[PDB]
Amino acid sequence: FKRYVEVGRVVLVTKGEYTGKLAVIVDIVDHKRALIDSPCSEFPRQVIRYGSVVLTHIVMKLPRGARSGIVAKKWKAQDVCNKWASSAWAKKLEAKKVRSQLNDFDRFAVMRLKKQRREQVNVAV
Amino acid sequence: VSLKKKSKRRTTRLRSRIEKKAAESKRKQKRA
Amino acid sequence: AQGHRLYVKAKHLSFQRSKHVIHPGTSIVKIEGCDSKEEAQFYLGKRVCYVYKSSKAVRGSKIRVIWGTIARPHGNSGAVRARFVHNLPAKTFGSSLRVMLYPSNI
Amino acid sequence: RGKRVVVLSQLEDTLVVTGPYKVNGVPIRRVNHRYVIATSAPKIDVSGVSVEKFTKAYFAKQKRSGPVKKDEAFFAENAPKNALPAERIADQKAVDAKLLPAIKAIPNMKEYLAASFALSNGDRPHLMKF
Amino acid sequence: DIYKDETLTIPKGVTVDIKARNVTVTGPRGTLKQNLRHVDIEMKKQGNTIKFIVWHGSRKHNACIRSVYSIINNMIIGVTQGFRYKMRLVYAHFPININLTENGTVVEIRNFLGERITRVIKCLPGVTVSISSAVKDEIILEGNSLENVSQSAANIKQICNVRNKDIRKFLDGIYVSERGNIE
Amino acid sequence: HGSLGFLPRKRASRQRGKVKAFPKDDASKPVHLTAFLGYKAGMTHIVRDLDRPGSKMHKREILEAVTVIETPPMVVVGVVGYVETPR
Amino acid sequence: ALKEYQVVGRKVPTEHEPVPKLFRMRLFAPNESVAKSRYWYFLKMINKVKKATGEIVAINEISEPKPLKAKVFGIWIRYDSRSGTHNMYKEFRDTTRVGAVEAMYADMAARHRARFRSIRILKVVEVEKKEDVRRNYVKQLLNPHLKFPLPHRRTKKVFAPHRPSTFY
Amino acid sequence: SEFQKVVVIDAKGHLLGRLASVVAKQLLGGQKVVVVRCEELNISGHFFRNKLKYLAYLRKACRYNPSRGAFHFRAPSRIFQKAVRGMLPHKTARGQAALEHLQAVEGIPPPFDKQKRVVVPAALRVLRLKPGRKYCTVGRLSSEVGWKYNDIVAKLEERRKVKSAAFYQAKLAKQKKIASAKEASPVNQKLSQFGY
RNA sequence: AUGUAUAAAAAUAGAGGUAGGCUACUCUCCUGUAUCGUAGAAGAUGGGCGAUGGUUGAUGAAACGGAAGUGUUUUAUUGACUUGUCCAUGAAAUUCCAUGAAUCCAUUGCAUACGACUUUA
RNA sequence: CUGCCGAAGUUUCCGGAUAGCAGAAACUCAGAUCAGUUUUAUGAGUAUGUAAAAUGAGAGUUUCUAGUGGGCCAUUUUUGGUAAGCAGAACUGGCGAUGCGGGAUGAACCGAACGUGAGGUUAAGGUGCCGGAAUGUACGCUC
């Protein structure tokens, strides 16, 4: 295996108003609930269910039950921000996010862009 | 299909007498 | 051929009904791409048309249309209730409908 | 339908709109606001084009007061070539002349109005943000 | 229990790969491939240790961990020392004639209880049958799979069965005498 | 009534008895046919030595009624190939 | 959604008892109306105090002082069964006393099919020391190196094109 | 979400009733559904239980012309079609038109082996059954109750998998060439701001 | 019908690779909200610039597809179009939604209540 | 043909009268009386009977004239019991004169009581498919 529910593991929220936000499991409440925290102020420390988050491959060295300030300090020290972005998974999510807030004029420019991209179809025989 | 030897769902007359059987049990306990 | 279809594709599911009583005045329409009552709110008040073909050439054309309007969402799955000028025939269950983008409010 | 147009002014009920006739060939027209999709495309100047001449009576059709219509010479009449006075092409050409430098300065504006909008597979209008 | 695990130390055995739960244990004596799809257990391989892990399993499923452990250990023993079963013929009056064909994978038994029917048994794959000269009326079944060897012994014993006779007085039959390893 | 294995009890749709099952094909055996078509002429009776070991009438003469069918050689006029399908 | 309610009440003052004893209970209920009803039920069954003769002097919801601190709560209850007389003790690990009671009610109705009215919570305590924990599943939670793969994952848009990963 | 005029569903790894329930509703919605590999369908419950269920179904017969009794079909596609048919108003002209839009087959015949095959997550066994729960395969259930074409379907499927794999390697090799030449065009990085 | 656009296989307590020598690498997965395709009087008329490709129509083919192969390629031409990048004309008053045999008649009797069946002509 | 009003469904005396329920006619009554109701008080044995505030409604009589005088089902108390059924009362309910939603189907079950319609929202029951509506959310149990 590569994803284990352990203290300090980074998770991505999939259900709820915090969908798409990154968090770190500060404690294991039980088999079905865990306490998470995030350095972002808009994300408050809260108890969430595992069914609402996906376990990411990133694990940070964080002591059990660390407060919000300690979690943020550990998060900055271990640069989990841009460590998650280094993965192609994050790039796809951001590329998906950028695309969805595109508008009609941008979509028009994209088709011209990708058709200029496609006009080559030049491969050595 | 069901693998049972009897229809698990009974007849309306059969369930009606079961409420009568429940009536008998009340008679056995309360008065009889 | 990708320069048209300013409409959204829909299907005539059934009529607004209970288990045994049908109300043909209003129909249930599943707009594809719409998957919740919140998304159905966008299509409320849009113009839905049922397009069919006939043998007689009325107005020199064999294509006839029945107009209608989406009224309200139906259930949690994103289906809506539509009222047509002529109540849709019961033979059109599962047939294709066309949801216009007007009256626009975007 | 599907043509992308530049809004000149808001009338009492409709919008006086016209695509640059040298781009998409859409004359000056009243269009009801319920048949319009407002896009987040960059705004084109309109202060340089005079719009007071665009009135409801100016766009109004001559009254008939009778059910009479429908003739071959009647359809041979009207037509884009004639039955419209030269001032109508005149003011529009003034509009395009005032409008073209604005659309030319900002890139992709001419091709965008040349193209016609249409829905494709996997397009959901309620989720797309024009 | 959240976590129930069993740990096994693998021997000089070459490969103990568990790809798709299929254990292709290759050893100096030979190779056996077996399937473990019947059990939902994690086989984690690390160096010389193999862990069978079950998370949040019930008692019924947790019972499979040791059973999976035993069959893995048994087959590993097979690829390293192997299994040899010594079966001794038991007769009172009629000699039991046993013939070995294609290096013993088929055993033909004749003259049992004076019967004229030739009882032919084909052994399971990986099992070879030999007649040891050290002890008379002695059959040796050596192979890699303890399952195959013991099943072969069971089939031979069940074929030579006494029917309608007093087993108290009729002692005729073939029975397994020793169950051990080749080395 | 008789055996229900024959309960359709109806006229045969065919004048010629159709073969319904052919012997299983084997690649090891070289190529050979498996059926022939004849015409029933009649029967007679014959005397044949009974070489049946263990029988009460071993090494003895028996009278057997035997049907005679005329079988002029057939002409192979064509060939048909059959493909196995899930149907 | 249950709520913890402090309900203090006493019988109406009279000449015989001008200063009636004030009795307080910490009891859980979806709303204040249910809590005051449950309080009256317990008071009648213990002190024989009639509802008409009594009155509710204070009702206050009690929030969790440390809702962000994982705890272990032990609950003593009087289980009502076929025989209608049973005592049980259970331990639940969570961050709120209300959550533990909610888990207690769900568990009992699940395992023993006991309704809200049949169940009466006798006492709820917070077991802070790991040693007093009596439950093996709870103890396995308090182990220092707790780590396990996520179980029961399982994951309109019908007709998916590819097969689900249902893994990492 | 969205429909297709014709939908090919790979029934391998699915559940009989869950797939049938989804398919029956889709047929009523006016869609045409083709179900391939009906011999690979799964049913919750161990084989012997499901075998006994089928034997009980076979037991239904009359004393007057068993031809008047229920016709019991052993093919896995016919078993699936029976499940779908009981979920449709088949005595009604609407349900009859729904049935004619269903085509359940064993294996993947040529007209569909070159077409995309979608799956139904609401019916996939891995997403619906707790691990360690006994289940049976309709192909094994069919072959043990009278179906006599299990081997022919198996052999034909192995050949199709070989041909499909060869097509994939050619497609994969082609995709690598376009993948390599993709970054050659500078525009992909010039205006990658749009998320493409 | 309104793009009637998309063919690996298997696993889910794992797969797929790349790069290596059934074993040592690291990377990817976490569904398609993807990829392909998409500007043009239903799509007009010419002119450049830059590819030297793409999309096809009609011929000529050879290889492939048998499970229901009725389709896959490779092409040799020919006729078009090309938006890859720029230009110049045209558009409208539709001046606010509507779209050769068989049969009967005969013949046979291997058949038969009557039809049917097998023959012959 | 349409409309309006609309029972009784049984006491009490010898098949009839009386009364009850329904109307009509003619009166007096609104600083008045009523009530399938609840309080308060008195006593007496949580109930009882008697009297005197709350709430509601205009409240009263006289004549005379129709129809009705069954049953079935269920709850509770109680009287006995008997292999076990049940048998005997009382009690007010439901049906009966009454369609409609649900319970797969139904004299007695759950809702609900009816002019013709449009819209909205619910009861009971439901939301995999048949079948309108979550292959919803969360926690367990079961092979």
> CA of G56 and C1' of I106: distance in angstroms?
118
Nearest chain C residue to H2, by CA = C32
C1'-nearest nucleotide to the CA of G110: J140
> What domain range is H178 assigned to?
151-196
Kindly list the distances between the CA atom of residue C92 and the CA atoms of B23, C11, C14, C15, in Å, as whole numbers in the listed order.
54, 9, 9, 10
Side-chain half-sphere CA neighbours of G84 within 13 A: 2
User: Residue at minimal CA–C1' distance from I6?
Assistant: H116
Distance H179 CA to I26 C1' (A): 20
- Counting as contact any 3 or more CB pairs under 8 A, the partners of D are A, C
D69 CB-to-strand I distance under 7 Å: no
- Measure CB to CB from residue C3 to each of D38, D116, D130 and give the nearest one: D116
Which of the nucleotides lies closest to B12 (Cα–C1')? Answer: J106
Q: What's the CA gap between A26 and A47, in Å, rounded?
A: 10
Taking contacts as CB-CB distances below 8 angstroms, the residues of chain H near G160 are 118-121
- Closest-lying nucleotide for C18 based on CA to C1': J132
Q: For chain G, which residues lie within 8 Å of any Cβ of chain E, measuring from their own Cβ?
A: 136-137, 140, 146, 148-149, 151
Strand J nucleotides below 7 A of a protein CB? 74-82, 84-87, 101-106, 118-120, 128-135, 137-143
Answer yes or no: do E55 and G148 touch at CB < 8 A.
Answer: yes
Residue C61, C-beta contacts closer than 8 angstroms, at least 6 positions apart: none
φ, ψ at E152 (rounded to 5°) = -60, -45
Note whether A47 contacts G150, CB cutoff 8 Å: no
Question: CA F55, C1' J63: Å apart?
Answer: 126
Distance in Å, residue H114 CA to nucleotide I72 C1'? 10
| Number of domain units in chain D | 1
Single out the residue of G90, G98, G116, G100 nearest to residue G61, CA to CA. G98
Report if residue G104 sits inside a domain. yes
DSSP summary character for residue E165: S
Which residues make beta-bridge pairs with E55? E3
Residue A8 to residue A30: CA distance in whole angstroms: 15
| Whether the Cβ atoms of residue C64 and residue C29 lie closer than 8 Å to each other | no
8 A C-beta contact, residue E77 and residue E10? no
Taking an 8 Å cut-off on Cβ atoms, the answer to whether G164 and H118 are in contact is no
**CB proximity H171–strand I (7 Å threshold):** yes
| C105 contacts D37 by C-beta, under 8 angstroms | no
Structural domain ending residue among the three candidates G67, G86, G101 = G67
Residue D102, H or E segment: helix D86-105
Task: Using alpha carbons, select from H1, H44, H37, H41 the residue that is nearest to residue H19.
Answer: H41
Question: Coil, strand, or helix at residue B22?
Answer: helix
Across all strands, nucleotide nearest G163 (CA–C1')? I31
**Domain check: are G82 and G132 in the same one?**
yes
- CA of A13, C1' of J4: distance in angstroms: 72
Q: Where are the alpha helices (DSSP H) in chain C?
A: 37-43
- Asked if E143 and E161 touch (Cβ cutoff 8 Å), the reply is no
Chain F: give the shortest CA distance to residue H79, in Å.
Answer: 15
Q: What is d(CA H126, CA H137) in angstroms, rounded to the nearest whole number?
A: 14
Q: Which residues of E touch H131 (CB under 8 A)?
A: 40
Calpha distance H27→H100 (Å, rounded) = 9
Report the DSSP beta bridge partners of residue G121.
G77
Handedness of CA E24, E25, E30, E32 (dihedral sign): negative
- Nearest CA-CA distance, residue A94 and chain H, Å: 8
Q: Which of D7, D40, D116, D124 to mutate to test the interface with C (most CBs of C within 10 A)?
A: D124
Which tokens is H88 given?
């449709």
Structural domains counted in chain C: 1
Residue G103 phi, psi (nearest 5):
-65, -35
Q: How far apart are CA C7 and CA C65, in angstroms?
A: 14
Within 13 Å, how many C-alpha atoms sit on residue C63's CB side?
Answer: 3
Containing domain of residue A28, as a range?
4-86
Residue C38's domain spans which residues?
1-106
* Strand, helix or coil for residue D2: coil
φ/ψ bin of H65: left (φ > 0), alpha (ψ from -120 to 50), beta (otherwise): left
- Touching, H vs B (3+ Cβ pairs under 8 A): yes
Q: C62: left (phi > 0), else alpha (psi -120 to 50), else beta?
A: alpha
- Relative to beta strand H32-36, strand H102-104 is parallel
* Residue from the list H4, H13, H119 with its beta carbon closest to the beta carbon of G160: H119
Q: Are residues G60 and G97 in the same domain?
A: no
H84 phi and psi, to 5 degrees? -65, -40
Q: Is B21 helix (H, G, I), strand (E, B) or coil?
A: helix
Contact G162 H119 (CB under 8 A): yes
The nearest CA of chain G is from the CA of H121 a distance in Å of 7
The per-residue b/e assignment along G126-158, b for 16 or more CB within 10 angstroms, e otherwise, is ebeeeeebebeebeebeeeebebbbbeeeeeeb
Is there a domain that residue G150 lies in? no
Q: What is the DSSP string of A41-97?
A: TTS--EEEEGGGEEEEEEE----TT--HHHHHHHHHHTT-TTTSTTSHHHHHHHHHH
Neighbouring C-alpha atoms within 13 Å toward the C-beta of D124: 14
Q: Which residue type does E117 have?
A: I
- Cβ-Cβ contacts under 8 Å, D115 against chain A: 108
Are A123 and H178 in contact (CB < 8 Å)? yes
CA of D90 vs chain C CAs: smallest distance (Å)? 31
**What is the domain partition of chain E in residue ranges?**
1-82, 83-183
Which of H150, H168, H188 represents a domain boundary (last residue)?
A: H150
- Resolution of the entry in angstroms: 2.8
Asked if D18 contacts D5 with a C-beta cutoff of 8 angstroms, the reply is: yes
User: Structural domain of residue G72, as residue ranges?
Assistant: 68-144
Q: How far is E42 from chain A (nearest CA, A)?
A: 9
Same domain assignment for residues G100 and G134: yes
Chain H: touching chains (3 or more CB pairs < 8 Å): A, B, C, E, F, G
**Which nucleotide's C1' sits nearest to the alpha carbon of D31?**
I96
Instruction: For H117-182, give the DSSP string.
Output: -BB-TTTBHHHHS-TT--EEEHHHHHHHHT---HHHHHHHHHHHHHHHHHHHHHHHHHHHHHHHHH
**Whether residues G91 and G79 fall in one domain:** yes
Provide the CA H182 to C1' I64 distance, Å, integer: 31
Structural domain span for residue D37: 1-130
Residue identified by tokens 């070159």 is H114
Residue/partner pairs of C86-91 with CB below 8 Å, 24 or more apart: C87/C24, C87/C25, C87/C27, C88/C12, C88/C24, C88/C27, C88/C50, C90/C15, C90/C24
Give nearest nucleotide to A99 (CA–C1'): I33
Indicate whether H146 and H157 sit together in one domain.
Answer: no
Q: At D99, phi and psi to the nearest 5?
A: -90, -30
The angle, 0 to 180 degrees and rounded to 10, between the axes of the packed helices H138-145 and H47-58 is: 50
Across the beta sheet with A53-59, the strand order is A46-49, A33-37, A22-28, A9-13, A53-59
Are both H194 and H146 inside the same structural domain? Answer: no
Instruction: Answer whether C75's CB lies under 8 Å from C37's CB.
Output: yes
Does residue A111 contact residue A119 with C-beta atoms inside 8 Å? no
CA distance G117 to F24: 75
